[PDB]
Amino acid sequence: VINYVEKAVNKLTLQMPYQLFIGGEFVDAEGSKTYNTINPTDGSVICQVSLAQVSDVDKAVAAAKEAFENGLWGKINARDRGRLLYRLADVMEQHQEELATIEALDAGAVYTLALKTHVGMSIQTFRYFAGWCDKIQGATIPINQARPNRNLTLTKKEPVGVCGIVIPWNYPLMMLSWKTAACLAAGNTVVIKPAQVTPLTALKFAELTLKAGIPKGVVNILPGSGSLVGQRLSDHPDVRKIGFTGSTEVGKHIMKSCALSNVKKVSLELGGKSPLIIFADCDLNKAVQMGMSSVFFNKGENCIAAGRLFVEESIHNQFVQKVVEEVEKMKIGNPLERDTNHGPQNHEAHLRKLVEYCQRGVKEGATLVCGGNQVPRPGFFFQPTVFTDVEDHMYIAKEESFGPIMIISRFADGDVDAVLSRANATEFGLASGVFTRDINKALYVSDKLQAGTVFINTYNKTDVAAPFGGFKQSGFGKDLGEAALNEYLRIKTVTFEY
Amino acid sequence: VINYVEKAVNKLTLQMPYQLFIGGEFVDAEGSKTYNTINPTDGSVICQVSLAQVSDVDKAVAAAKEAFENGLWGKINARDRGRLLYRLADVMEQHQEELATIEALDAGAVYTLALKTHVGMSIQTFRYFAGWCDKIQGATIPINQARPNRNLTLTKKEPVGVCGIVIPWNYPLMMLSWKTAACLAAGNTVVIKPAQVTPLTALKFAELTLKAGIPKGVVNILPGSGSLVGQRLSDHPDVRKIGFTGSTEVGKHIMKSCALSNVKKVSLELGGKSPLIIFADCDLNKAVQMGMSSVFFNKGENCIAAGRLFVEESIHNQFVQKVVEEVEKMKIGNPLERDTNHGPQNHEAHLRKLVEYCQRGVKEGATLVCGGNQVPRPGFFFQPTVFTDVEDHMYIAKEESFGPIMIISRFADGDVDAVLSRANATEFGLASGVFTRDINKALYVSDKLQAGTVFINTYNKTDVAAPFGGFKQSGFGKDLGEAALNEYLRIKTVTFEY
Amino acid sequence: VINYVEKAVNKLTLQMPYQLFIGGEFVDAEGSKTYNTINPTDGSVICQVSLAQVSDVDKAVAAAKEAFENGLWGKINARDRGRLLYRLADVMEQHQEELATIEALDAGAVYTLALKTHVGMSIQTFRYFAGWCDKIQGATIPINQARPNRNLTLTKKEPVGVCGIVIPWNYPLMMLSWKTAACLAAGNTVVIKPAQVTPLTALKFAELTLKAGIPKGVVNILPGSGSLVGQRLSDHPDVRKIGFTGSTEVGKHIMKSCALSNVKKVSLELGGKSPLIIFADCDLNKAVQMGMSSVFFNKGENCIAAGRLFVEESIHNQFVQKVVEEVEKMKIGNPLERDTNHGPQNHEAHLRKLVEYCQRGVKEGATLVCGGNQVPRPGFFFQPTVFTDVEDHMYIAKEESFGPIMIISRFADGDVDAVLSRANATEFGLASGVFTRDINKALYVSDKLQAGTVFINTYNKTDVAAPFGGFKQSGFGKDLGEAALNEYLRIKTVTFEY
Amino acid sequence: VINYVEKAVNKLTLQMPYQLFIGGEFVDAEGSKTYNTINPTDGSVICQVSLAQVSDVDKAVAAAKEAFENGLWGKINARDRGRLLYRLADVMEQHQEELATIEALDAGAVYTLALKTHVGMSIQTFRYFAGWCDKIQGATIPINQARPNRNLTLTKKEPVGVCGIVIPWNYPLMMLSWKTAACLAAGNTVVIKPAQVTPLTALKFAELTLKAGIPKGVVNILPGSGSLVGQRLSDHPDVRKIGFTGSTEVGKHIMKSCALSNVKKVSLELGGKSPLIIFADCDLNKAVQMGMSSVFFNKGENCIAAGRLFVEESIHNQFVQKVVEEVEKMKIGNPLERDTNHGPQNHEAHLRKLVEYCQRGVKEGATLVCGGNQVPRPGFFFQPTVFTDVEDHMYIAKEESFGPIMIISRFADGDVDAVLSRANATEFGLASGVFTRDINKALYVSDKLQAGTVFINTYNKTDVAAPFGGFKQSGFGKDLGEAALNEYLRIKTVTFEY
Numbered sequence A, B, C, D: 001v002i003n004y005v006e007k008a009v010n011k012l013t014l015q016m017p018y019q020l021f022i023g024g025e026f027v028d029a030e031g032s033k034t035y036n037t038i039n040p041t042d043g044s045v046i047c048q049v050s051l052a053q054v055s056d057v058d059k060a061v062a063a064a065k066e067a068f069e070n071g072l073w074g075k076i077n078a079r080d081r082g083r084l085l086y087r088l089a090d091v092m093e094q095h096q097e098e099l100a101t102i103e104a105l106d107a108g109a110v111y112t113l114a115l116k117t118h119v120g121m122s123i124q125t126f127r128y129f130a131g132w133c134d135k136i137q138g139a140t141i142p143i144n145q146a147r148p149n150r151n152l153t154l155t156k157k158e159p160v161g162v163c164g165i166v167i168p169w170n171y172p173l174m175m176l177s178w179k180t181a182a183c184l185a186a187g188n189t190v191v192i193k194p195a196q197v198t199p200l201t202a203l204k205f206a207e208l209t210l211k212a213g214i215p216k217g218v219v220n221i222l223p224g225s226g227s228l229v230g231q232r233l234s235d236h237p238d239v240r241k242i243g244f245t246g247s248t249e250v251g252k253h254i255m256k257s258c259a260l261s262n263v264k265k266v267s268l269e270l271g272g273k274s275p276l277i278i279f280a281d282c283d284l285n286k287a288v289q290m291g292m293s294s295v296f297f298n299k300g301e302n303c304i305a306a307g308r309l310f311v312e313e314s315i316h317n318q319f320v321q322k323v324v325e326e327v328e329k330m331k332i333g334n335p336l337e338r339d340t341n342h343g344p345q346n347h348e349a350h351l352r353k354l355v356e357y358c359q360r361g362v363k364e365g366a367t368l369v370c371g372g373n374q375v376p377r378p379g380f381f382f383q384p385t386v387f388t389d390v391e392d393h394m395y396i397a398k399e400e401s402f403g404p405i406m407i408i409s410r411f412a413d414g415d416v417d418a419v420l421s422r423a424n425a426t427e428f429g430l431a432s433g434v435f436t437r438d439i440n441k442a443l444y445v446s447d448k449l450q451a452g453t454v455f456i457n458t459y460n461k462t463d464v465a466a467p468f469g470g471f472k473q474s475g476f477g478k479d480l481g482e483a484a485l486n487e488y489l490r491i492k493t494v495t496f497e498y
């Protein structure tokens, strides 16, 4: 029997595993060490969670290695691997309300949104990649023939082997799902390290892999610290690939660690300062709706959030007025209240960073139009914030807040290349967007934006089939889409002479 | 007008540039610093070559950046970029005897081989990749529609931008060509750093780009040290990708440096300890010829050389006997002499390693059947070497020689999995091969070998259309084939709502 | 409420719909016309089935047209189309025993084979193609730019529209599934004409599309004659594509009718005279098992059955003795009995073709080693038959039996090119096979065989991911694999200037 | 030595072969029969050309079959086949002025346009497809494994064999090039039948294949009639594929003949009635320029010409005024004169049809704004024509003119779906276009148009990399792009068990 933290909430009885998941079983960490996970709605302790030690990382990797090399996962047909991943998606769907509730509790995700996105997209991710398993194909290649003999050259796509994945805290289940689905679809086994502050949906997911009949050791989950657990994963001689999403400084470190151990493969998604360019010829009311969403979606805790809005001179003031009108209509509160628009920030230290980010924005001369502070109420709520008169040299024009902070600059009527230059003048390159009714501007601007994703007349429109990843210091490699699979496969060339 | 080192040799008048190649012109390094390049046939100085400094790297990168951002290369059609690369191949073909002679002098490449392979394959490489330019395609993807609206999602394959490539000394022109052809075909610009010991064909190639009409700054070439020039390339904030081929330890350092600067993309080809498994049921005479080739081709200075031969017990002794017969027929001599089939080693420091390598081989208990020593003559010739009775724990069973040293172990008749385990018991995974007439054994062995390339009843059969790269500590990423383009492209996702 | 023919058989209750399926309802044909479907195990009438008339074809096409143009199927996400098809596969699985029992009744399919193949593969087919829906992708193409302007060229993959599929009787559910899964996955709607003699699993399948929630009109099924129903489908101005499997002569007529109406697209799978070449160096026992399978699988009513076996001189007599010994072991009888491994032929007229076929073989001088006659029991059982001394000019060397008749010729030891010539001396080119342990012979033979499928050391190894179709007079176009989708899609090129 | 018709024009000495091209040699037809090719600039006879007979077709096919089966073309590397095609493109470029001049004489192509398009694009076509040769790749497919055994499944892309291509007269060299380049790049051999009225660039092209070193029998060219030569190609038992561009009725007949002989593969490009929708929010002057090019380009003898322009009510009159202004400026004249904008129609019979066409347009009640008549000068010149007040029921709203006749209908302001319906009402679906600055309309309209090509804010922008082909009664199959290759290849599936 699995030990649960039990909690009657949201019309449900949540049953929440809290231990490490190694070789298909939930087990205490070395020395039964634990830590507290904190509810951001009221600052309370949800429960104690096992705190993985180095010896636990080694056990997880050994279980993953054994599962890949000798266990069933390495022997079944691609098609049957596919069936298991579909079945996993089904099981996640059967538990979707419970998962969304756990996410509401652990990450402060608004319940209605956690259902549709955090959980709904996770389900879609597994179903999408499940369909790839038997459609991953190599090549036959018309090489020059060693006359009078003949040659056949083919490629085989093969799994990389044991993978480590390090997840951030903003969408705990969904980031896990993005990377894990592609990893498992390609035939690998995995050790997953969730963000220390958000372990609960990952551990509930682990239990769901058991219900789905995923062979023991294919998935291992180790709550605990990046600098202990994540570090050992990057150093481990039996791990052949790291998939990472998080900050630029940690991504750099992780890549360095992959280098110094055994040149394991690495993919990096490192956040952004993504620009949204709104032209005077756009649909204005839509621009306001999508611009708001571009910033405030999931309380700003969103890798692709627009970190700067460039609004054409002649519509700037009307744009700002409408935004203020819309912001005042936002309902802030408990993520379980069904009319909540804006939930709390993920954890305390992030709230403090947002407070300091906004103090700095004011200090350096930007105009604070709304917000900029903690909402007085228990937990870690931050006021939806609007800054105008933001200039290109300012800190808040360069640094990613990862909070609900709209950062607006004007640009000159009928200038296009000039605004592009300012939009591209970051070392980040994750996402971007443009609002305009003009086909020629939209196409030209999408060509010129230096960003892995460009939205046109929409924002936050990700899709499990559409590859997502950064340029420049936003990193490299894709999650989602066919392209994600290539991070998790190797190519063997086989050349016959006959 | 360009300065040349002129040399009458091989019935040609060689005209060899010796300066840095920057922004379309040959220029002295900072402070007019130079170094000597050594002819390995006799130890003489061929000539003095500019020695690039930090400020020269910055200049090369600035030229590459300008050529990409504002120059013609970034504006022309993919089709026309292709035409220029074809033309470049034609120019190399027109200079094929001269390039082969420079490679003979600089790297000790046997002229007839240099013409067919070092140079001939280089020409094939530029022609092959020229064909890809207008055939690099993104996708349109059927994402979920935001009803009542519609969505269009497409991807664009874009160049990565400024690339640095760092080349080894074993096939100077060919390794340059492999990486440069893919890089340029993808629309990038490049700073190339040849091995310090082998700058000459690179510099001649630089001249050839001028003849072909490649726009100034697209190709920049910097003879000099890896610890100075290579390091700066890996550190440079405007370089977006490093392509590297060389030792595992330098590979690790480069990847580390890519991480710590601007998370530039990196590909690594890092050498190997590649097993060749020879079963009793093979064509024995062919196994001898191809076994010979697998070790001795290009005086063993060959990324994919078989570093271990495993020979089935019942044919082992007869295989060794026949190898000794063939080794005795090898004509050692000046690479310019027509009947030479074993040239000198590339440079002195490499000769020293080979001597030490075989001393250690004898020390640890292997049977030295022939060779092991520097040939008594001027230059840096090394006697074709055969070791038998090699055991798995031995240094020479583990470490890559990169020299003409056949390293032979027995395996028991009828064993298949046991020899596979032994063949896979390395941290390398670059290449491998199997000789057998049994279809079932050949297919099974090719599945089980943990290597990026598996040869079946042949060896050294590379092709410009067939991707080449390693697993495990042999690195990641491919040169050659369609797959190579992916290291030099990025994918932008563009999502419309309408 | 649907009308059923109900029958207690095989430990279950069959509930068989027997009417036309049009616009999501079961309906009588015009004038309530019917015909009898015959159980080949005892010659009895299973039930009466509606006999579609021209006005029923027009009704079915109109419903398909309306479902495509205005109904939900043409509006839902590709992903959701995929979900519906994966649900259809699930419902088929929930009815697997029932479907397999109907197939045993209607087509004489041995129940254990029908479960695993007729039905099992049909389920795989729908799951396979379900996974393609949101992975069908067009391209973005790097065209020459109309300077000083820019161009973007993309392709969209779109459905062709209303399709007609005409199905043979040998694998009623499976042929229906192969073609229908690919058709529906591509977003099309369809009118299916099962072979008149085998309508029952098609009509049960039709009911299953209702349980799966496939929108009305997407699937329409018309039991009836080819010369009436098939013809009108080929002629109809609103049908855009015909998918056909059947005889060469009907294929020709269908293609002609496609031409003369509205140049509707057409695919053709037209049977064959498939050669299996068995070399002396093969595993002989395995060659007997697979050789027997190549002929006798599904009582020889098998598109890809080996129609000639060429056996190397030195093993010929021993191959024949072993075949004779295994044939004696076959249990002929009721397809519903667990012991049976050879069921009756599909229908009476085909039984009489086989009797005549074997008479002609004897008359023209072939040696009848065993079989040749109807088995003396109720129904339409034919004896497993072996002919030897078959010469290239013989009728039975050229004509497709489509029955359990092994047709053996010798070839001289060491012949390879000579046997290949004889094996290719047909206007057919559907399948082929070779048994040999020799890698070089296997690869060479597979290159040289002029057939859409080459089996090596196996036979009948189809798979839902591996495309299947003929060369020459065996037709063109593929079923199964990614390639099948291409028959059911059109490519729209979109070129912007901006 | 080849017989020529020598002619001094355009400051060149033309050397024009005029005989059948069979098996690498120019030969007279059976009975030395000939016919006259007519210069459309003055009605004169250019020269006599051999008139191929049935026995000549058989000789050509026999030569093509021998070249494919036993000749060098079937034996060389894919890479070297490519080299020959790239050399063929070079030879064409060396002869470009001559080829453009022959085309000017034979087809009335304006010389400056023939250089850039008829000839320029032909050269691009051969170069583009030359690059595909060693990049045509099959697959390796992860099929279900016959446990405890293993399976490997791969596909080989193979040539179809002997092909016949049948070309129209509007772009004699370019149409020949589109189809022949893809056909030969795929490894096939070919028998080409140019339109009887335009044999001369085809015959000169034949001579160029000799200068390029294309092996004998690979290309065979048969000037003569469709009903004799084209018919025998469709019926021939050794021909495995027909590529056809022309009228719908001949297309139907061709497909019927493919069916009744040997179910040879067929592709069909059958012309169109392509709509161009011009919205009020477009760039009006650009719409006029592109609108005119959409009709008048190559004197309207253009497969993808806009056959109807729908112009939004509020800009209709101004659009017509501006078109009239621009039409008055077009310079009609000898195609060899540098100032000529508008050359003669291709041949007399076509001129007569255009005259009759416009008589009928006036009769049925459309407003003739200009032209409609043969130009009063020698040869077969037709005045650029503009019709307004065209109604959907009119003959000229339905029938393809294939001449320089702009056919304008109005549509109500704001009426998107209504105009789409009218634009789609036709049984053709070759091309279409839309001019609008509005991104949402542009994307919506392109989804809704039922045509193989949709131009957005441009027209006639074809590219050798962008596939081109029709929907509905405009046929199926693509010329150009990667997709064109699939018409000329077959897929062989090879499945091993081991």
Ligand SMILES: NC(=S)c1ccc[n+]([C@@H]2O[C@H](COP(=O)([O-])OP(=O)(O)OC[C@H]3O[C@@H](n4cnc5c(N)ncnc54)[C@H](OP(=O)(O)O)[C@@H]3O)[C@@H](O)[C@H]2O)c1
Binding pocket: B166, B167, B168, B169, B170, B193, B194, B195, B196, B197, B224, B225, B226, B227, B228, B229, B230, B231, B234, B245, B246, B247, B248, B250, B251, B253, B254, B269, B270, B271, B272, B302, B303, B304, B353, B400, B401, B402
């Ligand atoms: N299988 C392949 S492809 C291969 C190829 C070469 C060598 N090896 C292995 O390595 C051994 C020889 O070692 P080696 O010294 O000749 O090869 P490496 O040192 O790995 O040299 C490869 C390239 O990297 C450069 N480099 C060195 N330090 C660098 C740094 N900090 N940053 C950037 N670039 C740097 C080198 O420059 P310098 O010119 O200053 O050295 C050279 O151009 C061989 O015996 C063999 O075992 C393998």
